Amino acid sequence: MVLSEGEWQLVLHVWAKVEADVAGHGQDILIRLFKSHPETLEKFDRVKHLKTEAEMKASEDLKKHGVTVLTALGAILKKKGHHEAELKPLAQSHATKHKIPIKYLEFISEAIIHVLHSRHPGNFGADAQGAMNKALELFRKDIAAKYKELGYQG
Numbered sequence: 001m002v003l004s005e006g007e008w009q010l011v012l013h014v015w016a017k018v019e020a021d022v023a024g025h026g027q028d029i030l031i032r033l034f035k036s037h038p039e040t041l042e043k044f045d046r047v048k049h050l051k052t053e054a055e056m057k058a059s060e061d062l063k064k065h066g067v068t069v070l071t072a073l074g075a076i077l078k079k080k081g082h083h084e085a086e087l088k089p090l091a092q093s094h095a096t097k098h099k100i101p102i103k104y105l106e107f108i109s110e111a112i113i114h115v116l117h118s119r120h121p122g123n124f125g126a127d128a129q130g131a132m133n134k135a136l137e138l139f140r141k142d143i144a145a146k147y148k149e150l151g152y153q154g
């Protein structure tokens with residue numbers, strides 16, 4: 001798939017808002033993922049023992065993780081589709097060290113879209129959400145192809 005420049009502009013315009021508070025958005029997204037799909041919390045060995053949302057909000061380790069996820073995703077989105085180099089190390093560690101099925105990447109995509117919709121309603125109307133969904137679908141498709149080359153396809 002290929003996004004048009006106008007679709008990339010819609011994605012990078014909300015993303016510029018997210019970047020005003022990377023840690024806050026990282027927390028919101030990972031908490032929305034873990035509450036919605038608790039099975040995903042089990043993959044994180046540093047924070048899989050957290051039992052409530054209040055504990056999640058207070059966890060410094062979860063907040064650092066969130067910043068790591070969003071910073072790596074933001075670098076991929078700014079490439080506007082030319083992300084081959086960035087995707088290699090990410091696909092290798094998530095397929096052979098962490099073992100993250102593609103399904104879980106769908107779940108976090110859903111959490112990203114939920115949080116942007118709640119926090120940025122004016123910059124995340126239907127056309128901007130469709131463009132972000134296309135950008136995350138592109139990311140998932142390219143990672144799934146790399147998973148396959150690596151021998152995992154999860």
Ligand code: HEM
Nearest residue numbers: 040043044045046068069072073090093098100104105108
């Ligand atoms: C937007 C998608 C994602 C991005 C951009 C992302 C990026 C990262 C980055 C940059 C790291 C640290 C470097 C590395 O290990 O590769 C990381 C670590 C990790 N990721 Fe992801 N990730 C994504 C989705 C996920 C999902 C959906 C899960 C699990 C349900 C996951 C589980 C992990 C785990 C278990 C680690 C190691 C955490 C620790 O240090 O103990 N990742 N991820």
